């Protein structure tokens, strides 16, 4: 029931539930980010 | 032209008389040109 | 695009009828050169010549068209100033790395940064030109040839810098190196004549050998323009 | 996309009817290729074959379509010049951090610059190619494998550069490293002062690790066959 008029109005709502196949962003984004993320703790092993 | 001048300067800094030969004229001009530019 | 950015481009225009053919309407020209006195000038592209002629097909006989040719020419100043001058000012530092001494600790900075500036210029020249795979421009051939010269200088620079830092206790190395590499040098035109100072005089021979054969190909391959 | 960019695509083109169907109109073909008489040549892509089929569904029997297939070969020069030549000229410097001696202090510059240049090329072949996850092209797979090889090299290079700069004032010294690293040498075909013996162990452990990189780099590039 809407704001203007005093009758009620039907409608049909469609819902679409979609997933993302994840291998492309796995092989191109979190492999280099997680691969250079293991280099952060390394500089303390290096002699001064 | 500054990078060509500083690779020549960095070449002439690290010489030594075991591996090089001092110029037979460089002493007069460079101990002449240090008090023209107010340096020792 | 072979003589970029000095080339002489050619762009045509076909006027053909649309629903009719050769036995119904017939396109006749009126003036061999199309009219050009309402032209505002164009800034970059000047117009050299502009003819137009009638084509008709001798084995089809349902085909008339009138084709115009535009022969346009670049004015070459702006692309010279922005992409020939910084290209040449970068690529003259290829031969510079052998004139460093090895003791400074600054070889690898120079030759690695020269390789990365060269591949950035190769990608931007390849973003200007079309992706027609028939032909390359002369800028792309020259930049790819000086990039393979720079990575050959990477490999011989790390072999020189391994030869320099040896020691009397670790490296012995045998008679051959003494016999060859204290006789090679006055045929390389030096002027010279106790193992820790022997190894640095091995290292200052071999890059002076490699400065001779890398100023060789830089004036040999650059008359591959001609 | 698996053989990018030497690939051979296959692009479909369907034609149906819009209002009618098989019990009112009936599509049929004339000749079994499309006409290539007014095809001007294109530049980038080049055609090979253009077959035409008529399909029909035997479980429905109210459905015709005429589908053409275009089988296209890409001219491979442009992406070779921009993408294959700097990739091979950068991945030819992966195994060259080991031959570099540890005194000069230049291992980190060479190995960090190789790792960042391979990551920049991996993001360019990310931004060109379509983001399907049904397949992965062979250039990105090979660049990811040599990226894994370069970061294994940077962890073992910082361990070699730690073990070079020890001294008898700091490190106690253990005789286990004498019995391992003076037996190791004729298995690596060498020949040959408490402070200077630590400079000899770091000239062995890299040249062990040079020999297992050339074991790997002529096993991976052999494995693309
Ligand atoms: C080389 C190749 O596989 N081409 C195929 C063709 O054989 C097939 O008829 C069509 C539909 O799948 O798609 C394309
Ligand atoms: C310009 O292009 C047209 C179309 O191929 C050709 O007929 C003509 O000869 C060309 N002229 C020049 C000078 O390249």
UniProtKB/Swiss-Prot annotation, chain A:
The record's disulfide annotation reads: 4-5
Q: Where does this polypeptide localize?
A: Synaptic cell membrane; Cell membrane
Tell me what gene encodes this: CHRNA4
Linked pathology? Epilepsy, nocturnal frontal lobe, 1: An autosomal dominant focal epilepsy characterized by nocturnal seizures with hyperkinetic automatisms and poorly organized stereotyped movements.
User: In UniProt terms, what function does this protein have?
Assistant: Component of neuronal acetylcholine receptors (nAChRs) that function as pentameric, ligand-gated cation channels with high calcium permeability among other activities. nAChRs are excitatory neurotrasnmitter receptors formed by a collection of nAChR subunits known to mediate synaptic transmission in the nervous system and the neuromuscular junction. Each nAchR subunit confers differential attributes to channel properties, including activation, deactivation and desensitization kinetics, pH sensitivity, cation permeability, and binding to allosteric modulators.
Name of the featured protein: Neuronal acetylcholine receptor subunit alpha-4
Q: Transmembrane region positions?
A: 29-48
Tell me the outcome of changing residue 3 to A. Loss of CHRNA4:CHRNB2 channel opening potentiation by divalent cations
Q: Which family does it belong to?
A: Belongs to the ligand-gated ion channel (TC 1.A.9) family. Acetylcholine receptor (TC 1.A.9.1) subfamily. Alpha-4/CHRNA4 sub-subfamily.
Q: How does it assemble?
A: Neuronal AChR is composed of two different types of subunits: alpha and beta. CHRNA4 forms heteropentameric neuronal acetylcholine receptors with CHRNB2 and CHRNB4, as well as CHRNA5 and CHRNB3 as accesory subunits. Found in two major stoichiometric forms, LS (low agonist sensitivity): (CHRNA4)3:(CHRNB2)2 and HS (high agonist sensitivity): (CHRNA4)2:(CHRNB2)3, the two stoichiometric forms differ in their unitary conductance, calcium permeability, ACh sensitivity and potentiation by divalent cation. Cells produce predominantly an (CHRNA4)3:(CHRNB2)2 nAChR.
**Coiled coil spans:** none
Swiss-Prot record, chain C:
Q: Where in the cell is it found?
A: Synaptic cell membrane; Cell membrane
Q: Which residues lie on this side of the membrane: Extracellular?
A: 125-138
Q: Which residues cross the membrane?
A: 81-102, 108-124, 139-163, 207-226
Mutation effect (residue 44 to A): Reduces CHRNA4:CHRNB2 channel opening potentiation by divalent cations
What happens after mutating residue 129 to M? In ENFL3; approximately 10-fold increase in acetylcholine sensitivity
Q: Which residues lie on this side of the membrane: Cytoplasmic?
A: 103-107
- Glycosylated residues are 10
As for family, the record states: Belongs to the ligand-gated ion channel (TC 1.A.9) family. Acetylcholine receptor (TC 1.A.9.1) subfamily. Beta-2/CHRNB2 sub-subfamily.
Q: How does it assemble?
A: Neuronal AChR is a heteropentamer composed of two different types of subunits: alpha and beta. CHRNB2/Beta-2 subunit can be combined to CHRNA2/alpha-2, CHRNA3/alpha-3 or CHRNA4/alpha-4, CHRNA5/alpha-5, CHRNA6/alpha-6 and CHRNB3/beta-3 to give rise to functional receptors. CHRNA2:CHRNB2 and CHRNA4:CHRNB2 nAChR complexes exist in two subtypes: LS (low agonist sensitivity) with a (CHRNA2/4)3:(CHRNB2)2 and HS (high agonist sensitivity) with a (CHRNA2/4)2:(CHRNB2)3 stoichiometry; the subtypes differ in their subunit binding interfaces which are involved in ligand binding.
Report the function annotation for this chain: Component of neuronal acetylcholine receptors (nAChRs) that function as pentameric, ligand-gated cation channels with high calcium permeability among other activities. nAChRs are excitatory neurotrasnmitter receptors formed by a collection of nAChR subunits known to mediate synaptic transmission in the nervous system and the neuromuscular junction. Each nAchR subunit confers differential attributes to channel properties, including activation, deactivation and desensitization kinetics, pH sensitivity, cation permeability, and binding to allosteric modulators.
The disease tied to this protein in UniProt is: Epilepsy, nocturnal frontal lobe, 3: An autosomal dominant focal epilepsy characterized by nocturnal seizures with hyperkinetic automatisms and poorly organized stereotyped movements.
**Under which name does UniProt file this protein?**
Neuronal acetylcholine receptor subunit beta-2
The coding gene here is CHRNB2
Which residues of the whole protein are included?
159 to 478 of 502
């Amino acid at each position: 029931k809407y704001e203007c008029c005093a009758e009620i109005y039907p409608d049909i709502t469609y819902a679409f539930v979609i997933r993302r196949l994840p291998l492309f962003y796995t092989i191109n984004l979190i492999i280099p980010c997680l691969l250079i993320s293991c280099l952060t703790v390394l500089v303390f092993y290096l002699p001064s | 032209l500054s990078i060509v001048i500083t690779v020549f300067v960095l070449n002439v800094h690290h010489r030594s008389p075991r591996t090089h030969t001092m110029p037979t004229w460089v002493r007069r001009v460079f101990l002449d040109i240090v008090p023209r530019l107010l340096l020792m | 695009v072979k003589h970029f950015p000095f080339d002489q481009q050619n762009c045509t225009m076909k006027f053909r009828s649309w629903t009719y053919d050769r036995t119904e309407i017939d396109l006749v020209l009126k003036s061999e050169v199309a009219s050009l006195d309402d032209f505002t000038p164009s800034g970059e592209w000047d117009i050299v010549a502009l003819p137009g002629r009638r084509n008709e097909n001798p084995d089809d006989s349902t085909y008339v068209d009138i084709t115009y040719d535009f022969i346009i020419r670049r004015k070459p100043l702006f692309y010279t100033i922005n992409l020939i001058i910084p290209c040449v000012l970068i690529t003259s530092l290829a031969i510079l790395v052998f004139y460093l001494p090895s003791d400074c600790g600054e070889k690898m900075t120079l030759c690695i940064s020269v390789l990365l500036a060269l591949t950035v210029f190769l990608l931007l020249i390849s973003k200007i030109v079309p992706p027609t795979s028939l032909d390359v421009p002369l800028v792309g051939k020259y930049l790819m040839f000086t990039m393979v010269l720079v990575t050959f200088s990477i490999v011989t620079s790390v072999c020189v810098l391994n030869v320099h830092h040896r020691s009397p206790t670790t490296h012995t190395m045998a008679p051959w190196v003494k016999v060859v590499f204290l006789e090679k040098l006055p045929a390389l035109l030096f002027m010279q004549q106790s193992v820790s100072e022997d190894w640095k005089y091995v290292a200052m021979v071999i890059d002076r050998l490699f400065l001779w054969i890398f100023v060789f190909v830089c004036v040999f391959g650059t008359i591959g323009m001609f």
